[PDB]
């Protein structure tokens, strides 16, 4: 339902959660989501992938103590995961991705 970057972005600024329909990698494990197969959209459908943690090892995203980063597919809807992430912080910083952390822009 809601999976755009602006869309998300302005949620999660707003009502500091993600949506519904979002759900975190072991929760999709789950219910039967094995990665290699593609098949989140059949055991989960309507379903993202999102709310994970994301650990920023190569310290690209602005660190502080006590901040926090996480992480959540966009324009995701069947097949594989795509390439698409916003990262969001605990203070509601919020950075999108479209090539699988490489790269990072501000969008709020």
Do not use: M
Request: net charge positive; charged share 25%.
């Amino acid at each position: 339902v809601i999976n755009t970057f602006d869309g998300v972005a302005d949620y999660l600024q707003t009502y500091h959660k993600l949506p519904d329909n979002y759900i975190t990698k072991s929760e999709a494990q789950a219910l039967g989501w094995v990665a290699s197969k593609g098949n989140l959209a059949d055991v989960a459908p309507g379903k993202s992938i999102g709310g994970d943690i994301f650990s920023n090892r190569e310290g690209k995203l602005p660190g502080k103590s006590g901040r926090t980063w996480r992480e959540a597919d966009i324009n995701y809807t069947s097949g594989f995961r795509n390439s698409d992430r916003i990262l969001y912080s605990s203070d509601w910083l919020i950075y999108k991705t479209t090539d699988h952390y490489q790269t990072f822009t501000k969008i709020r």
